[PDB]
Each structure stands twice: as structure tokens, then as C-alpha cells.
Design a protein around this ligand. Sequence first.
Ligand SMILES: *Cc1c(COP(=O)(O)O)cnc(C)c1O
Ligand SMILES: [Cl-]
Ligand SMILES: [Cl-]
Ligand SMILES: [Cs+]
Lengths: 394, 254
Amino acid sequence: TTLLNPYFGEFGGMYVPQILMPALNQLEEAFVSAQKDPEFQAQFADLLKNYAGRPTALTKCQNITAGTRTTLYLKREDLLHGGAHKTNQVLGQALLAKRMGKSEIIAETGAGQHGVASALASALLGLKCRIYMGAKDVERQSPNVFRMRLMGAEVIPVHSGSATLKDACNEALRDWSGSYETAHYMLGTAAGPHPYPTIVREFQRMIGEETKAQILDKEGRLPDAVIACVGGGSNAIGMFADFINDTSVGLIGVEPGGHGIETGEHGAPLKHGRVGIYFGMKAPMMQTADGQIEESYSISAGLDFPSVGPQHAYLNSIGRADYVSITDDEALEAFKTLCRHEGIIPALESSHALAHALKMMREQPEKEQLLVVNLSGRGDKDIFTVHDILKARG
Amino acid sequence: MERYENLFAQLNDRREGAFVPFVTLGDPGIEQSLKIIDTLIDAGADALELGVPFSDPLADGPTIQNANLRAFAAGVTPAQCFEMLALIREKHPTIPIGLLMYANLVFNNGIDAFYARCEQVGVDSVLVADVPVEESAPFRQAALRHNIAPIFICPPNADDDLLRQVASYGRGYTYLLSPLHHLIEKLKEYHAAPALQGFGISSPEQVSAAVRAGAAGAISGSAIVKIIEKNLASPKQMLAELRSFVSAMKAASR
Ligand SMILES: *Cc1c(COP(=O)(O)O)cnc(C)c1O
Ligand SMILES: [Cl-]
Ligand SMILES: [Cl-]
Ligand SMILES: [Cs+]
């Protein structure tokens, strides 16, 4: 028994060991309580505005849409403290942790940016924070490891299994099962067991709520479509949420295509996976024919999640949102195009969203359309990977 | 044929407790694991709890985490796990065979189809480690439709509503992790399936204490796999120490 529906249509649930169910029922009730508490909302808004920098800007692209009838706006979550949208929900989760009397934070991460997000939130709110990460992710993201440890976080490498994010997701839950009375599990995306998909959406929905008010102020109308990249689905559902009942607004989520879908080396389980049960949820997943869960490949480190949030799978099955894929080369071209034409270095994650927007604009250049792309992060972390690839090609 | 009801009836007629060892199928190899299971049963194992190698066992500790890696390294797949299970049933018709599963391997080829193949190979029970009793409806229905016992874990943090659900929907036996004496009473009160205490059961003193506490037996998980993990280079000395340990733990239940 729960207060909220753990399922979005046929997707979702709480597929955790029985020992973790009290930790989830506790987290749900604290969340429902915090949602009705004006003091919790006032403190959440206070950290978002005076510490993270909300509201973020909505930049109209001057030069990128020349020659076409497309008006492109960029929701600048890249201007948030930390450099990505992940700061919004970790501030809410850490405030929830204080509401439950928790003094420790457990977090998993792959690319290291959620770990950096969790470390900065725990440091601000006075929480001891230990972070699990794949040992192979520890070696490729040593800059982000130093960031977390500079901010007082304990980085524990996970050599289990594949030594990647899905093993960090495992090792964190193992810790939380015996420490949930003092520690809180700060999940990274809009996936995992209930109430995490619901919680991360509500702590990220200011993205779309601001975008709506800003586009009404600037263009006097709602957008034709909002486009966002999808790793687990936090920045996409944060943009989509306030537009779902606006049925004239298109909801496009972009999944990593890697080297191409037909090559198998991608990360698009929502459209090219198979529905399974893992990480406490029923959702589309990257998995073998026998049911072993694979890893998502992408040039984007932040899109390495082998599954997808259940509300996205639900939104897709009913046709409310559409989900496409963008290859590594398409996102790279979008990366270079935004730099030369707007002076904004985007994250390789958000470049997938922009890449599809450029596709919509380029394939039908005389189509009059108002598009908003959620720029979920800056790309200064990616200039080294972009350099080595453009140094290798030629 | 409910081998659990007939094993618990027997063990009650001799005022004994059950000793149920756990191993991962195909660890460290297919042929080696088959001889390992044969060693456990001759040593005095009353039932068997067997694990199918899963790529992401988020509910198991590092010692079993390595057992899955040792099995994946040998190439064991769910397909040859069930041909193993079939061979084990044809060798030991009376012993109860339990499976520790994860929800994806059950859901993968259809839930009802997974339990259909367990019934084909003679599996008596299945515990799905990552399906709580609140999400158990479709799994236990498919398990009962194929004469499989749905096994449920009753954790130490169990409130009264959980004990009532585990008693109602649980069959075969109840997986106790754990004063457990108060939890054993409430399960007997609500007519739950006989409770097997499975948590760090390492020494013969813990098998004895579990029975005295009121449980119907003890489940040893990491203890057996640790012995396999220790003697990976010595095949027989592994079985040798396996036979000594299991017959010591089985005597602790008499
Ligand atoms: C984390 C990451 C993503 C993927 O996160 P979602 O859960 O899909 O929202 C997207 N953009 C950036 C900058 C990221 O770091
Ligand atoms: Cl601002
Ligand atoms: Cl605003
Ligand atoms: Cs993904």
C-alpha cells in the first residue's frame, strides 16, 4: 500500500528486495508531506534561486536558424550552479533528507556529474555524502572524482560486474538497505523504484514551468515542440511535465544512437530495447536475449543509463510524447554548430536534443515552427573528448 | 508433489531441523557445480536453494557476486541452468529444490512460461529476490498455476501487515533473515509456511540456535560458496571440505 500510484500505465513499480520497502514507504510519505508544506517549498525555492541561480535564461538563437522559418529557444540549464540540471533535484532530495532526520547521503554516478551534484548539495546542507562509482568510470572521470572529493565526498569505486553505472546503482542500494534509518539514497534520474520517478519529476518540473512562462512572455504563445535528451529522463520529464496537459505542445525526447541503432552500440532502450524489470522498475531496457542487462553506448557519458524512466515509457505508449534517436556524429555536429554560431559550448548530452532540432529545421526549412530545446548542461567537461575525436579524424 | 510438506513432516517425526545450503548453478563450472550439488546432498542437505547467474544481483553480497562472475566466466546461461536442474531432479527425486531468482530472468520469456519450465524440470519453489510481496500478484499466481511455491523473504524490519501477507501468500517455506523468537511466534500465529532462518548461518551453533528459536531450519548462503571460492584450484579438496561442513551443519539440526 502506497499513497501514490507506483505505476505509469504498465510501467514503474517498486521491484526492490522486501528489506527496502520500508525505506520507500518512508520516502514517499515524506515527499507527499513536503509537497503540502509551504515551509518546505519556501526553502526549496530559496536554494534554487539564491544558491543555484534559478530562474535560468531562455535564449533565442539568433544565428543558428538563419535561412529557415524556425524560431529556436534554448532553456539554459547549463547556467545552473554545477553546470547541469541535476542540481535542482539533489537540492530537493537533500532537503527531503533533512525532513526525514537523515544525516548521510548515498549516491551513484557514472559520468561523475550526479556525484558532483550530490556532493555540492550535501556540503551545503551539512550531510556526510558517500558516492559509489564504477571503477572504469573512476579512471575516465578523474576530474569529476577530484571535484566530489574537494567538496568533502567519499568516492567508493565499484569493481563489481561491469564496473559501470548499473553496478554503482547496485552497490548503493545494498548500502541503503542497512542504513536507510540514517542515510538517504539520492537517486540520479527519473528512473528507479517508486517514488523516485515521481519525486525527481516534481523537483525538476520548474524547468518546464519557467519555460512556459518565459515563452509566453517572449513569443506570446506556447511552443510547437519541446526537445530534450533522455538518459534516464530527469531533464526531459522536468521540461515535459508542465506541458503534458497542453496537448498542442509536442514532447520530443532524444535517446543516444551511439554508432547507429543497427550497429547495436547505442543507448535507446525506449525505442530499441525490450521491457524488463531491473533497478526497481518495469521499463524498457538494454538487455540480451536471455535477460542479462547490457550497457548503453554513447559518445555522451551522461546518457549511459541502460533503461529509461517509466513515465517516459508510458508517455510513449499513449502517443503523448515522441522519442527519436541521434547518433554520435549528429550530436557532435550540433556541438560544433552551437559553438560557432551562438558562443555556447553545450554538453554532449544536450547536443543530442539540439541535433534533432537542427534536423527538424534543416529537413523542412520552410516550415514555420517554434521549438524549445532544453540545454541540460554546459560542455566544458566534453572539450577534451571532442578534441581527441577531431584530432583522430584526420 | 509438495516435497516440502513431506520433508517437514519427516524432519518433525525425527525432531530434526532442515539444513539448506545455497550455491550458484554452474559455479565455477557446469560439471563442477553438478558434482558440488551431488556432494551437498550426500553430505546431508535436506533441501536445496539454487541461484541462476544474473548480471546484476543487487540483493546479494560480494561472495555471491563473485559466484555469478565465476559462472558467467564459464558461460552458464539460464538455458543450461534448467538442463542442470532437470538432471539434478532425475538424480534426487525427493529433495526440495528451491530457486533464488531475479525478476528480469522470470519476466524475460513471459512470467507464466518461466514457471512452466520449472514445473517441467521439477523445481519445487522460487523466491524472486527483487519482487516484494506488494508486487507479488502476477508472480505467485503463475507459480501456483504450475504447482510452484512462491517463497517470500520476511526481513527483520517487518511490521504486522508484512507478516500477515507473507503468511497468506507464502508457500513451501518462509525465508527468515532476522529477537527472532517474536517473529517466529507471529508466523506460527498467522499459519505461515515453516520458517527457514537464512542469514550468516556459518557455524553449526547457528543451525542449532535457529531450531531452538522455533524456526524449522537454517539456510547457509555465503558459507558454502566461500568454501568453493577458497578451493578453486583444488577440485576434490573443495568437495572434501564441502562434505565435512555440510554434514557438520546437518548434525547441528538433529
Ligand atoms: C545527467 C545528464 C543527462 C542525462 O540525465 P537525464 O536523467 O536523462 O535527465 C543530460 N544532460 C546532462 C548535462 C547530464 O549530465
Ligand atoms: Cl538568473
Ligand atoms: Cl519566470
Ligand atoms: Cs538511455
